[PDB]
Ligand binder design. Structure first.
Ligand SMILES: COc1ccc2c(c1)cc(CNS(=O)(=O)c1cc3ccccc3o1)n2CC(=O)O
Lengths: 275, 287
């Protein structure tokens, strides 16, 4: 007996078993199931993921809201209802981990670099939960922001390596008017910090344009912009190929930066074409 | 979809081919059964095939893939029995419609990268001196389940620790598959069927009956408690020539962080010359 699903309405499920049943039932009636995993506290970046999912013809949008211990509820639900989303999946920690921590995903060596330097088991947690969510919902496509680019690349590796049957859709970073990448962390910045934070996106965009003049020009331009900001402690600034291997001589790449402003760690990244 | 001819053995090497065929069969109302194997098929494997066949409306997929990732040294890997002609002939005789025989390059085109890390059971018993062994098994089994997407997957109780680890895999990753354990098939004297039995010379084959004798002796001794069951098994192993015991352990049926109660599993590993044999049996304690 399938749990109740009311079409055109926000249906909220906490039991993984229930959302599994509704998703399968929906797949069998011609819906294309789109998954948008979130950690709640939704903002415009999250709504951009929702909107991208919503525009696939015959889509039903599943938004998961799960605070992963290994990696405003009513506010959030009203936004989704406002976006015309039909399923929120809101499971408990116990429901996700009924046997506690046991079998897990071990990321490849990319997980040890960049963000995996300050947080070396962060990515295992993320990939473990994403794999679980994929298996519960069995979506046709799953949506992630390019904001967390290294995470996104690790998810693409998960999907490839485990032969998962889902398309991974990366959605361009939603930005404030001055270019700052949207993030929940942005609200912790004092005005001096928030004005200085603009150096991350400014550096990366300056780098993307300088790149007609080569990889070195691109990197030196980004470094100059970051060097013009006070109180911006750069953790890394790295040019890599699109899959985060070493940057090819010329061609397509990604430039990633991370910096601490007071106690707030900020990240950004951008597409780079070399020459 | 590639060609699929019902009532005939259809052999696919490309993951995409078997995946497409499987999905199309499921969408037609057939139930897809998977029996993951490392080839060198013997009567133990045919029991799994038979169990799968008797699921009504089943189409049966047997995979044959000697998985490098669950082997320690390349030495082990090169020595593994490969008899693919006997394998396919046995599958034909059993009425299996799909054999899935992937290449190493197709399964691991990027080498080792994202893997499954099993829970702490993978470090005990067989996993003790082989710390990456069960990671290798769970990784390839996860991949096979995702490629084939079966309704049910069949594993022998012979490799009992493996079966338990697969059940954990399936629970913890929320996989939508039923795991079916099939009772150990035995030779007339009680010897558990195994691809390793071929390495026993005549003396060794004679001595090897001691494992199953010891376990069945234990299961009946167990009315007198755990110590009696254990000491019965040990006496029988000790009375056998050229049988070096590696472990003999009585655990809970889940083999887990839980004390043995009424129902347990008695597990043995022993060396005959260079050949390492395993067996295990259900044990009820104080009956
Ligand atoms: C499209 O424009 C943007 C811009 C910034 C964005 C996003 C989109 C999305 C995010 C954060 N990712 S998430 O909360 O949806 C998430 C949920 C989840 C669940 C399980 C595992 C990993 C998971 O990751 N951010 C940045 C941020 O909020 O810091």
């Amino acid at each position: 007996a399938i749990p109740a699903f009311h079409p055109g309405e926000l249906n909220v499920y906490s039991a993984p078993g229930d959302v599994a049943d509704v998703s399968r039932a929906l797949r069998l009636t011609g819906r294309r199931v789109m998954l948008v995993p979130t950690m709640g506290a939704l903002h415009e970046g999250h709504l951009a993921l929702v909107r991208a999912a919503k525009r696939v013809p015959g889509s039903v949008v599943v938004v998961s809201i799960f605070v992963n211990p290994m990696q405003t509820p009513d506010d959030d639900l009203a936004q989704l209802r406002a976006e015309g989303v039909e399923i929120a999946f809101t499971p408990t920690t116990a429901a996700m981990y009924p046997d506690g921590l046991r079998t897990t995903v071990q990321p490849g060596p990319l997980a040890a670099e960049l963000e995996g330097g300050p947080r070396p088991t962060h990515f295992a947690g993320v990939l473990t939960v994403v794999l679980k969510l994929l298996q519960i919902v069995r979506p046709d496509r799953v949506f992630f922001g390019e904001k967390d680019y290294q995470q996104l690349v690790l998810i693409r590796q998960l999907v490839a390596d485990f032969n998962l049957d889902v398309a991974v859709v990366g959605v361009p970073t939603v930005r404030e008017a001055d270019g700052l990448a949207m993030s929940s962390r942005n609200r912790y910045l004092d005005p001096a910090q928030r004005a200085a934070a603009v150096a991350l996106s400014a550096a990366l965009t300056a780098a993307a344009h300088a790149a007609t003049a080569g990889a070195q020009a691109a990197l030196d331009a980004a470094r100059a912009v970051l060097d013009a900001a006070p109180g911006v402690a750069v953790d890394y600034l790295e040019l890599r190929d699109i899959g985060l291997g070493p940057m090819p001589l010329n061609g397509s790449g990604r430039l990633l930066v991370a910096a601490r402003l007071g106690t707030t760690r900020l990240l950004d990244n951008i597409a780079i074409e070399i020459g």
